[PDB]
Design a protein around this ligand. Sequence first.
Ligand code: PJN
Ligand code: PJN
Ligand code: MG
Ligand code: MG
Lengths: 227, 227, 5, 5
Amino acid sequence: GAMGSMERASLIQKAKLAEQAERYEDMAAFMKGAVEKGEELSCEERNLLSVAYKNVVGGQRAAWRVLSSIEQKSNGPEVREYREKVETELQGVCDTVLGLLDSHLIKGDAESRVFYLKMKGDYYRYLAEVATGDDKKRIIDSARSAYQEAMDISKKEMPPTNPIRLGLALNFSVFHYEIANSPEEAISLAKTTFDEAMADLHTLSEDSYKDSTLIMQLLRDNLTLWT
Amino acid sequence: GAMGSMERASLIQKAKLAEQAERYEDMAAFMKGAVEKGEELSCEERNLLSVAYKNVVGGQRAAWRVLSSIEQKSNGPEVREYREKVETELQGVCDTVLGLLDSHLIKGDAESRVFYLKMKGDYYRYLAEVATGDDKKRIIDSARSAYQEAMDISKKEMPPTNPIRLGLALNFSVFHYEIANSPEEAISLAKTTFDEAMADLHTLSEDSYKDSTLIMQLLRDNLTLWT
Amino acid sequence: FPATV
Amino acid sequence: FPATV
Ligand SMILES: O=C(C1=C(O)C(=O)N(c2ccccc2O)[C@@H]1c1ccc([N+](=O)[O-])cc1)c1ccccc1
Ligand SMILES: O=C(C1=C(O)C(=O)N(c2ccccc2O)[C@@H]1c1ccc([N+](=O)[O-])cc1)c1ccccc1
Ligand SMILES: [Mg+2]
Ligand SMILES: [Mg+2]
């Protein structure tokens, strides 16, 4: 493809250059070409992939919500039209990632399998944010199943302070509140996740405790805004 | 072209939507299609055009300087390669605007003619920032001539507090310092421009004084960093 | 909006 | 960098 004549190592190098330059579209593109070499990604490579696509899709969601809110207060076809144009681009990026996950990445180490399944649920969540009708809750089921399988693996194979486990549960909680119309389970899981991290705070790791304490603060922040 | 089936008015509407959504690439694209309808642009439309393309090219310049600085401290071809890739995109956007100016916009009212000629010098300046060799100072001459013609019109037909006149002179001063290797004329014109705005401060306008006082502060800021 | 990571 | 507008 676009990047198939480039060495995988150079693609990783340039993904990092693009991150320094805040060229997240380029970053995602280099990382996609790297994934497509057919070898698995290290922890650091996994995170370059997630960062790139999160920035790209994050800016698309921010634009969609602007226009969508304008489109609500307005109720000429121009706002619908343009909202729909951004919506269709957002859907294309989600499909790209979801295809990368099912075609190459998901397949491994437990932290690895949780990571990708949490991404599958996340980008199914972003599609759900803009979908409607029969297509919609087909998406919601897809998101839930990806999240559920990831929760089971992380409870079994990861300590309760692990930042992927914590971050997974923060996002599954948000899925419950904002997507599945169940503030109850959202609050329960957020509080269970925090309480259990504190019960076994001795499991924090030299390499990752800063990350865990941050996600734990975010779990409290979501409970504070939901109470 | 891409937008030729769309009403000019809808294109203006959607340029404004894209600005609210911070989709400056879309904004530039809608404004280009609007320009290409062949009618002149109002003051407000002129500013939608400049804003769009300034954000697009501004992000490209920020990325180029990151990589270029990395490329200097590094003295593998990957940094050169990627710098060159961003460089070539930056050149494409400048050529797009410069072609829009010569093919459609320059052609009118005096504020109008100054506005476009200042853009021609500006985007010739951004090409000069990355050019080399014979191609380079061919660009510098192009920038200077555009700026000079705009200075003459604004001195003759505009008051010294007019924000386009002030902004033009701020940028021509910067052209002298950063591009033409002449800190002398850069400082002179910046100080002349400020002093003359203050001499005739009674000419500030109800509709634009906030803009003039801001550019006047920026003129002082550049003198402060150049002294 | 609530926080995600 | 110096200021431009
Ligand atoms: O920037 C952040 C991270 C990285 O740079 C990185 O290597 N992390 C990491 C730490 C331990 C094990 C595996 C890992 O990947 C971080 C990370 C943590 C959770 C999630 N998540 O999606 O749940 C993704 C990445 C970061 C992002 C959000 C809150 C705190 C920190
Ligand atoms: O946002 C800014 C502006 C607008 O929204 C706008 O309508 N202006 C305007 C005011 C009077 C006459 C004609 C005009 O176009 C502003 C403007 C002023 C100078 C320049 N320049 O390039 O020199 C471009 C636009 C703005 C940008 C920079 C510093 C202050 C203000
Ligand atoms: Mg990080
Ligand atoms: Mg403005």
